Design a protein around this motif. Structure first.
Motif, PDB file in Angstrom:
ATOM      1  N   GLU A   1       0.844  -1.199   0.000  1.00 53.17           N
ATOM      2  CA  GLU A   1       0.000   0.000   0.000  1.00 53.17           C
ATOM      3  C   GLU A   1       0.892   1.266   0.000  1.00 53.17           C
ATOM      4  OE1 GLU A   1      -2.706  -0.579   3.335  1.00 53.17           O
ATOM      5  OE2 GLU A   1      -4.130  -1.441   1.892  1.00 53.17           O
ATOM      6  N   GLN A   2       1.961   1.224   0.814  1.00 49.06           N
ATOM      7  CA  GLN A   2       2.936   2.297   0.989  1.00 49.06           C
ATOM      8  C   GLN A   2       4.214   1.981   0.229  1.00 49.06           C
ATOM      9  OE1 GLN A   2       2.509   5.442   2.767  1.00 49.06           O
ATOM     10  NE2 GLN A   2       1.835   4.758   4.834  1.00 49.06           N
ATOM     11  N   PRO A   3       4.713   2.908  -0.597  1.00 50.59           N
ATOM     12  CA  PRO A   3       5.941   2.624  -1.361  1.00 50.59           C
ATOM     13  C   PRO A   3       7.234   2.831  -0.551  1.00 50.59           C
ATOM     14  CG  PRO A   3       5.165   4.823  -1.871  1.00 50.59           C
ATOM     15  CD  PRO A   3       4.209   4.277  -0.868  1.00 50.59           C
ATOM     16  N   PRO A   4       8.423   2.401  -1.032  1.00 46.47           N
ATOM     17  CA  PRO A   4       9.667   2.717  -0.302  1.00 46.47           C
ATOM     18  C   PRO A   4       9.800   4.222  -0.067  1.00 46.47           C
ATOM     19  CG  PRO A   4      10.087   1.074  -1.964  1.00 46.47           C
ATOM     20  CD  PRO A   4       8.713   1.623  -2.248  1.00 46.47           C
ATOM     21  N   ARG A   5      10.085   4.591   1.196  1.00 48.24           N
ATOM     22  CA  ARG A   5      10.158   5.977   1.651  1.00 48.24           C
ATOM     23  C   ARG A   5      10.914   6.077   2.990  1.00 48.24           C
ATOM     24  NH1 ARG A   5       6.668   2.736   3.154  1.00 48.24           N
ATOM     25  NH2 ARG A   5       5.775   2.793   5.260  1.00 48.24           N
ATOM     26  N   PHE A   6      11.215   7.304   3.411  1.00 49.21           N
ATOM     27  CA  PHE A   6      11.744   7.596   4.736  1.00 49.21           C
ATOM     28  C   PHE A   6      10.534   8.067   5.575  1.00 49.21           C
ATOM     29  CE2 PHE A   6      15.838   7.734   2.647  1.00 49.21           C
ATOM     30  CZ  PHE A   6      16.657   7.180   3.614  1.00 49.21           C
ATOM     31  N   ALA A   7      10.374   7.534   6.826  1.00 44.77           N
ATOM     32  CA  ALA A   7       9.276   7.940   7.718  1.00 44.77           C
ATOM     33  C   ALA A   7       9.408   9.441   7.978  1.00 44.77           C
ATOM     34  CB  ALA A   7       9.313   7.184   9.025  1.00 44.77           C
ATOM     35  N   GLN A   8       8.301  10.164   7.769  1.00 41.76           N
ATOM     36  CA  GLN A   8       8.306  11.598   7.896  1.00 41.76           C
ATOM     37  C   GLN A   8       7.771  12.067   9.230  1.00 41.76           C
ATOM     38  OE1 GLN A   8       7.319  13.393   3.913  1.00 41.76           O
ATOM     39  NE2 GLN A   8       7.712  15.294   5.073  1.00 41.76           N
ATOM     40  N   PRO A   9       8.479  13.015   9.912  1.00 44.02           N
ATOM     41  CA  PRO A   9       7.998  13.505  11.218  1.00 44.02           C
ATOM     42  C   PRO A   9       6.576  14.021  11.129  1.00 44.02           C
ATOM     43  CG  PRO A   9      10.222  14.275  10.818  1.00 44.02           C
ATOM     44  CD  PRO A   9       9.735  13.700   9.522  1.00 44.02           C
ATOM     45  N   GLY A  10       5.753  13.643  12.096  1.00 45.76           N
ATOM     46  CA  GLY A  10       4.350  14.045  12.119  1.00 45.76           C
ATOM     47  C   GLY A  10       3.370  13.000  11.607  1.00 45.76           C
ATOM     48  N   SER A  11       3.888  11.799  11.297  1.00 45.93           N
ATOM     49  CA  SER A  11       3.116  10.636  10.856  1.00 45.93           C
ATOM     50  C   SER A  11       3.118   9.592  11.988  1.00 45.93           C
ATOM     51  CB  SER A  11       3.710  10.022   9.575  1.00 45.93           C
ATOM     52  OG  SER A  11       5.057   9.583   9.708  1.00 45.93           O
ATOM     53  N   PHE A  12       2.096   8.692  11.987  1.00 42.66           N
ATOM     54  CA  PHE A  12       1.974   7.559  12.925  1.00 42.66           C
ATOM     55  C   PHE A  12       3.228   6.622  12.807  1.00 42.66           C
ATOM     56  CE2 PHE A  12       0.688   3.012  13.374  1.00 42.66           C
ATOM     57  CZ  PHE A  12       0.277   3.007  14.689  1.00 42.66           C
ATOM     58  N   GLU A  13       3.629   6.375  11.535  1.00 45.40           N
ATOM     59  CA  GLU A  13       4.747   5.539  11.210  1.00 45.40           C
ATOM     60  C   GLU A  13       6.050   6.109  11.722  1.00 45.40           C
ATOM     61  OE1 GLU A  13       5.167   6.805   6.441  1.00 45.40           O
ATOM     62  OE2 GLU A  13       4.382   4.824   7.017  1.00 45.40           O
TER      63      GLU A  13
ATOM     64  N   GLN B   1       8.629  -8.176   5.225  1.00 43.50           N
ATOM     65  CA  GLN B   1       8.133  -9.231   4.382  1.00 43.50           C
ATOM     66  C   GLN B   1       7.623  -8.624   3.070  1.00 43.50           C
ATOM     67  OE1 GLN B   1       5.368 -11.657   7.057  1.00 43.50           O
ATOM     68  NE2 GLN B   1       6.450 -13.165   5.790  1.00 43.50           N
ATOM     69  N   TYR B   2       7.522  -9.447   2.012  1.00 41.55           N
ATOM     70  CA  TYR B   2       6.980  -9.086   0.693  1.00 41.55           C
ATOM     71  C   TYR B   2       7.861  -8.137  -0.136  1.00 41.55           C
ATOM     72  CZ  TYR B   2       3.229 -12.008   2.464  1.00 41.55           C
ATOM     73  OH  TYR B   2       2.538 -13.044   3.035  1.00 41.55           O
ATOM     74  N   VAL B   3       9.145  -8.192   0.151  1.00 37.50           N
ATOM     75  CA  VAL B   3      10.191  -7.486  -0.563  1.00 37.50           C
ATOM     76  C   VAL B   3      10.751  -8.513  -1.589  1.00 37.50           C
ATOM     77  CG1 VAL B   3      12.490  -6.380  -0.371  1.00 37.50           C
ATOM     78  CG2 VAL B   3      10.752  -5.943   1.354  1.00 37.50           C
ATOM     79  N   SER B   4      10.883  -8.061  -2.848  1.00 36.60           N
ATOM     80  CA  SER B   4      11.410  -8.822  -3.963  1.00 36.60           C
ATOM     81  C   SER B   4      12.677  -8.118  -4.408  1.00 36.60           C
ATOM     82  CB  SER B   4      10.389  -8.845  -5.097  1.00 36.60           C
ATOM     83  OG  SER B   4      10.153  -7.551  -5.637  1.00 36.60           O
ATOM     84  N   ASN B   5      13.478  -8.805  -5.227  1.00 42.69           N
ATOM     85  CA  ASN B   5      14.714  -8.289  -5.831  1.00 42.69           C
ATOM     86  C   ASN B   5      14.486  -6.958  -6.540  1.00 42.69           C
ATOM     87  OD1 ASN B   5      15.800 -10.742  -5.094  1.00 42.69           O
ATOM     88  ND2 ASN B   5      15.654 -11.582  -7.166  1.00 42.69           N
ATOM     89  N   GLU B   6      13.346  -6.847  -7.236  1.00 38.21           N
ATOM     90  CA  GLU B   6      12.906  -5.667  -7.973  1.00 38.21           C
ATOM     91  C   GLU B   6      12.491  -4.530  -7.063  1.00 38.21           C
ATOM     92  OE1 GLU B   6      11.750  -9.279 -10.642  1.00 38.21           O
ATOM     93  OE2 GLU B   6      12.183  -8.923  -8.518  1.00 38.21           O
ATOM     94  N   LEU B   7      11.746  -4.838  -5.965  1.00 40.78           N
ATOM     95  CA  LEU B   7      11.349  -3.811  -4.989  1.00 40.78           C
ATOM     96  C   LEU B   7      12.560  -3.187  -4.289  1.00 40.78           C
ATOM     97  CD1 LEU B   7       8.923  -2.180  -3.587  1.00 40.78           C
ATOM     98  CD2 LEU B   7       9.172  -3.873  -1.710  1.00 40.78           C
ATOM     99  N   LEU B   8      13.565  -4.034  -3.978  1.00 38.09           N
ATOM    100  CA  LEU B   8      14.825  -3.662  -3.333  1.00 38.09           C
ATOM    101  C   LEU B   8      15.607  -2.753  -4.265  1.00 38.09           C
ATOM    102  CD1 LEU B   8      16.403  -4.150  -0.658  1.00 38.09           C
ATOM    103  CD2 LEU B   8      17.422  -6.124  -1.772  1.00 38.09           C
ATOM    104  N   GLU B   9      15.592  -3.052  -5.549  1.00 38.61           N
ATOM    105  CA  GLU B   9      16.244  -2.243  -6.569  1.00 38.61           C
ATOM    106  C   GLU B   9      15.573  -0.873  -6.732  1.00 38.61           C
ATOM    107  OE1 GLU B   9      17.698  -2.430 -11.235  1.00 38.61           O
ATOM    108  OE2 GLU B   9      17.430  -4.343 -10.159  1.00 38.61           O
ATOM    109  N   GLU B  10      14.238  -0.813  -6.749  1.00 37.50           N
ATOM    110  CA  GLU B  10      13.495   0.474  -6.853  1.00 37.50           C
ATOM    111  C   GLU B  10      13.746   1.346  -5.642  1.00 37.50           C
ATOM    112  OE1 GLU B  10       9.451  -0.969  -7.419  1.00 37.50           O
ATOM    113  OE2 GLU B  10      10.220  -2.221  -9.056  1.00 37.50           O
ATOM    114  N   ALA B  11      13.748   0.697  -4.458  1.00 37.11           N
ATOM    115  CA  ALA B  11      14.012   1.363  -3.191  1.00 37.11           C
ATOM    116  C   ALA B  11      15.419   2.008  -3.105  1.00 37.11           C
ATOM    117  CB  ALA B  11      13.799   0.384  -2.061  1.00 37.11           C
ATOM    118  N   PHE B  12      16.506   1.270  -3.439  1.00 36.15           N
ATOM    119  CA  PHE B  12      17.865   1.834  -3.341  1.00 36.15           C
ATOM    120  C   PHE B  12      18.294   2.771  -4.473  1.00 36.15           C
ATOM    121  CE2 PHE B  12      19.440   0.757   0.817  1.00 36.15           C
ATOM    122  CZ  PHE B  12      18.438  -0.076   1.252  1.00 36.15           C
ATOM    123  N   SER B  13      17.566   2.697  -5.613  1.00 39.26           N
ATOM    124  CA  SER B  13      17.789   3.563  -6.768  1.00 39.26           C
ATOM    125  C   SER B  13      17.606   5.052  -6.432  1.00 39.26           C
ATOM    126  CB  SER B  13      16.955   3.142  -7.966  1.00 39.26           C
ATOM    127  OG  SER B  13      15.595   3.495  -7.768  1.00 39.26           O
TER     128      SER B  13
END
Ligand code: PRO
Ligand SMILES: [Cl-]
Ligand SMILES: [K+]
Ligand SMILES: [K+]
Lengths: 259, 254
Positions: free
Chosen positions: A199-211, B105-117
């Motif tokens: 649901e949430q994409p790769p990100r850095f947790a931002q101050p002011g959020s529950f996360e 959990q639910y991290v794939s090789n591709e997700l790891l690549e998008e994340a560190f890019s």
């Protein structure tokens, strides 16, 4: 497309037709034959063992060397065969062991000679760091599981000493981890938990959020775990250095009358 | 003449070309080495990218197209005699390799690549998996250059990098590069007096009644104490993690 004449494909000391040059071939047509399999791998020189499972759509083939198996794997993986897309992978090793607490002056050859008492050793390696210094860990790969079981049993019951130093080695089964194929997106089960997590994409947790609150608590807990582990490491190192000093001082009392 | 193979596939699916994974180190080069001579040596292993030969030191680097081609070139050219020198062909040490731990959990090789890019150009990202395909919770992130890896190393320690919805940040550390291939051959061991003192006694089992039997038994007891210590730390950590998660869930409102 590239043609290469292979002149050197056996590494120094490499034994041939070991489990390190054994490939698993999956998603085979149900009607596959030994001759079909042999023809598929014909290009990759001499073949040893060819095994096809009576009903399961998988088999094994042993190639001469790791190089030849690595080439065959890359070339033949995902190859279409009679409506099926073949899966070609390195076979999982049935008789590989981790050797810990290796003393100094242990070479790959000495490790092989030592473990050869339990059965046929295919390969033995003293693991080294980026400066060629031994890590204290090693790998012993036997040709068959009975020899590996013998080593495991004998080395837990008894004290297996490789050198003059009276400290026995620890022999455990190899934790086999695939750091090459890993976890492709296609192989991830797309269930409810998957979608919740994505649901949430790769990100850095931002101050002011529950996360951010929770992620900061998680960071603090990870730092506490690091401190806990560092203290155990320090206690163990101190305990080991004490015993290792007694071991070195008692060993330097052996050749006193021998020479 | 040897084994001739018409290679039809040397690129792994998703593999980027001319990466550091396909970069080779070539030491013990003769003093009269040229870029053209170097290129001609590796000509049989397809296209070459970067070719670097040191000002005077007698070593260089060559980038081949894929990991497979570099593996073939390494095996063929390592320890080869050239102008009285025995070449040392090895994979170049990766300058920008990271170990990612505490992977959700639910991290794939591709997700790891998008994340560190986000920190820079990613050569390869792998979610490490066991002998059943279950993730170990460790991964590898390899970057094209050292600054991208240092950026990720700094950013992830300062901040909380979350890959999924689960609010637990990943741990990023430099890759511990260990050689489990060449290891320690007998040829590389200096056969001095200490060597012979250590190899005086052959591999054997400590026999009851000996002094070595007493020290081996003390060592066995110490190892068992270390196992008990570690088991308690593991239990405490698991309990603490489960507790934190339960507090967060209690706090949660949809
Ligand atoms: O590994 C864990 O603790 C959680 C489970 C879902 C996401 N990460
Ligand atoms: Cl090197
Ligand atoms: K030896
Ligand atoms: K994806």
């Amino acid at each position: 497309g590239l043609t290469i004449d292979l002149k050197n494909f056996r590494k120094p000391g490499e034994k041939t037709f070991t489990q390190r040059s054994r490939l698993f071939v999956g998603n085979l047509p149900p009607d596959i034959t030994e001759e079909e399999m042999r023809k598929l791998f014909e290009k990759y020189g001499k073949a040893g063992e060819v095994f096809i499972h009576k009903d399961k759509g998988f088999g094994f083939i042993r190639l001469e060397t790791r190089t030849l198996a690595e080439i065959a794997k890359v070339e033949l993986d995902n190859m279409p065969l009679r409506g099926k897309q073949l899966r070609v992978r390195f076979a999982c090793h049935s008789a590989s062991l981790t050797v810990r607490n290796l003393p100094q002056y242990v070479s790959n050859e000495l490790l092989e000679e030592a473990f050869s008492v339990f059965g046929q050793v295919e390969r033995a390696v003293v693991i080294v760091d980026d400066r060629g210094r031994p890590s204290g860990k090693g790998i012993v790969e036997f040709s068959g599981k009975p020899a590996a079981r013998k080593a495991l049993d004998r080395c837990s019951e008894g004290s297996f000493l490789l050198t003059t130093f009276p400290r026995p080695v620890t022999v455990e089964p190899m934790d086999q981890l695939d750091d090459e194929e890993g976890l492709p997106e296609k192989l991830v089960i797309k269930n409810q938990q998957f979608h919740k997590e994505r649901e949430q994409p790769p990100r850095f947790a931002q101050p002011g959020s529950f996360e951010y609150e929770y992620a900061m608590r998680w960071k603090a807990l990870i730092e506490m775990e690091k401190q806990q582990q560092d203290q155990v490491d320090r206690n163990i190192k101190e305990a080991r250095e004490k015993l290792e000093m007694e071991m070195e001082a008692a060993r330097h009392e052996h050749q006193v009358m021998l020479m």
